[PDB]
Design a protein around this motif. Structure first.
Motif, PDB file in Angstrom:
ATOM      1  N   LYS A  39       0.811  -1.227   0.000  1.00 22.76           N
ATOM      2  CA  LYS A  39       0.000   0.000   0.000  1.00 22.76           C
ATOM      3  C   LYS A  39       0.845   1.278   0.000  1.00 22.76           C
ATOM      4  N   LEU A  86       0.704   3.947  -2.974  1.00 21.69           N
ATOM      5  CA  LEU A  86       0.253   5.331  -2.773  1.00 21.69           C
ATOM      6  C   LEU A  86       1.334   6.363  -3.043  1.00 21.69           C
ATOM      7  N   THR A  87       2.578   5.999  -2.770  1.00 18.63           N
ATOM      8  CA  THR A  87       3.693   6.838  -3.159  1.00 18.63           C
ATOM      9  C   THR A  87       3.765   6.990  -4.693  1.00 18.63           C
ATOM     10  N   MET A 115       1.336   6.740  -6.714  1.00 17.19           N
ATOM     11  CA  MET A 115       0.215   7.579  -7.110  1.00 17.19           C
ATOM     12  C   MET A 115       0.513   9.051  -6.923  1.00 17.19           C
ATOM     13  N   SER A 116       1.056   9.420  -5.763  1.00 19.04           N
ATOM     14  CA  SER A 116       1.395  10.819  -5.504  1.00 19.04           C
ATOM     15  C   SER A 116       2.383  11.338  -6.518  1.00 19.04           C
ATOM     16  N   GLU A 155       0.717  14.340   0.694  1.00 17.22           N
ATOM     17  CA  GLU A 155       0.441  13.445  -0.410  1.00 17.22           C
ATOM     18  C   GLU A 155      -0.717  13.992  -1.188  1.00 17.22           C
ATOM     19  N   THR A 197      -4.195  10.507  -3.317  1.00 19.55           N
ATOM     20  CA  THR A 197      -4.234   9.085  -2.942  1.00 19.55           C
ATOM     21  C   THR A 197      -5.660   8.732  -2.499  1.00 19.55           C
ATOM     22  N   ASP A 218      -6.379   7.566   0.360  1.00 23.90           N
ATOM     23  CA  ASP A 218      -6.442   8.087   1.738  1.00 23.90           C
ATOM     24  C   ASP A 218      -6.744   9.607   1.824  1.00 23.90           C
ATOM     25  N   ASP A 263     -11.261   1.749  -3.045  1.00 23.54           N
ATOM     26  CA  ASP A 263     -10.185   1.014  -2.368  1.00 23.54           C
ATOM     27  C   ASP A 263     -10.605   0.207  -1.146  1.00 23.54           C
ATOM     28  N   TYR A 303      -5.858  -1.224  -5.064  1.00 24.81           N
ATOM     29  CA  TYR A 303      -4.927  -0.108  -5.179  1.00 24.81           C
ATOM     30  C   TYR A 303      -4.131  -0.145  -6.476  1.00 24.81           C
ATOM     31  N   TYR A 313      -4.197   2.778  -9.409  1.00 26.55           N
ATOM     32  CA  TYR A 313      -2.957   3.373  -9.871  1.00 26.55           C
ATOM     33  C   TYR A 313      -2.703   3.187 -11.376  1.00 26.55           C
TER      34      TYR A 313
END
Ligand SMILES: [Cl-]
Ligand SMILES: [Mg+2]
Length: 295
Positions: free
Chosen positions: A51, A55-56, A58-59, A216, A219, A221, A241, A277, A281
């Motif tokens: 995850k 998410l990194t 994605m950012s 971020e 994402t 989140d 998600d 996820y 992405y």
């Protein structure tokens, strides 16, 4: 290819629910995503494998897509990144952070909906009568909030509140940039079949007074991701998600009463969530997660 430092060589400076921040030097920080996942305002016992890395990725994708200056200070493989957190940590500039949660809403849900149902307004915006769950808001609304208790929900505030926090001209800038960036990202995602219903940014200011997107960005989140194929105004939309996690926790197997700390997730639910996820992405970025860096 310089030997990567150990994470222990840096000073741990802050810890959030699923993120960590380290001081690298006077002017730089290491921004680390963990595999922790939160549901119903609990950080769950079970991590979602990869995850943080996803998410990194994605950012980084979204920082590249957007034209606005951002806090990235080197590439995702920068030698200052420890091996241990490779793919889930970024080298960034230290900034003077502005204490405003910069939220854009293209759709009416969550605390925005609740405020509207109570008051007819959200964050100082008096809205049309007759809206409801997942109603489209066009133009999107700037719905700023402030962080509160350790503790509580973020407090929704109006534009005047933001002016009092950062200055009149700066508040105008926060408004304008938040709406601009959200609008662009939302149209991009929708074109790929994913609605970004809303999003939260934090900005800082650099030594020269320039506004810089930090934290971020976009994402699942920091944004509500929805499947566009299934969008229907008037009903609660599934989390792109987190819906498998939510359904399991509130379903028959968990043995957990959501109305009165949740148990661990099945491994099969965690792996399925990891797959969601990766789907989000890849669909949004047009890139392959298999090409994303790791230890
Ligand atoms: Cl909300
Ligand atoms: Mg992150």
């Amino acid at each position: 290819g310089s030997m990567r430092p150990s994470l222990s060589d840096y000073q741990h400076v802050a810890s959030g629910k699923v993120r960590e921040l380290y001081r690298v030097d006077d002017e730089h920080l290491l921004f680390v995503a963990t595999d922790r996942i939160s549901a119903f305002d609990f950080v769950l016992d079970t991590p979602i494998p990869d995850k943080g890395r996803i998410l990194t990725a994605m950012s980084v994708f979204f920082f590249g897509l957007l034209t606005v200056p951002n806090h990235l200070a080197g590439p995702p493989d920068d030698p200052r990144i420890p091996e241990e957190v490779l793919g889930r940590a970024l080298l960034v500039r230290r900034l003077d952070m502005l204490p405003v949660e910069c939220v854009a809403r293209g759709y009416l849900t969550g605390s925005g909906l609740l405020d509207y149902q109570r008051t007819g307004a959200v964050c100082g915006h008096v809205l049309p009568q007759g809206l409801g769950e997942a109603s489209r808001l066009d133009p999107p609304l700037f719905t700023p909030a402030t962080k509160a208790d350790i503790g509580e929900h973020d407090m929704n505030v109006d534009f005047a509140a933001v002016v009092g926090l950062v200055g009149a001209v700066r508040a105008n800038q926060l408004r304008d940039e938040t709406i601009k960036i959200y609008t662009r990202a939302a149209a991009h995602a929708l074109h790929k079949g994913i609605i970004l219903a809303d999003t939260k940014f934090e900005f800082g200011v650099d030594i020269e007074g320039n506004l810089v997107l930090a934290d971020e960005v976009f994402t699942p989140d920091s944004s509500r991701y929805w499947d566009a194929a299934h969008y229907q105004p008037g009903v609660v939309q599934d989390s792109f998600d987190k819906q498998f996690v939510r359904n399991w926790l509130t379903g028959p197997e968990s043995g957990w009463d959501r109305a009165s700390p949740p148990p661990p997730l099945p491994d099969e639910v965690a792996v399925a969530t990891r797959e969601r996820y990766i789907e989000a992405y890849e669909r949004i970025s047009g890139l392959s997660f298999s090409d994303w860096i790791g230890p």
